[PDB]
């Protein structure tokens, strides 16, 4: 869905989605915002 | 797995 806008979804070639998040600096595979 | 470090973008 819609991120917090710190994170963006790039896809891997190993076949998995990771966020890079620029505010946090850190990675997370999937949507936070999905989460509730 | 552990996502790889935001510093840069796997290419696999």
């Known amino acids: ?36 | 797995s552990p996502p790889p470090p935001y510093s840069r973008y796997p290419m696999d």
Do not use: F
């Not at chain 1, 070639?13 to 595979?29: M, R």
């Open chain 1, 1 to 36: 869905g819609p991120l917090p806008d710190g994170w963006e979804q790039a896809m891997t070639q190993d076949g998995e989605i990771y966020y890079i998040n620029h505010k946090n600096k850190t990675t997370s595979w999937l949507d936070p915002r999905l989460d509730p």
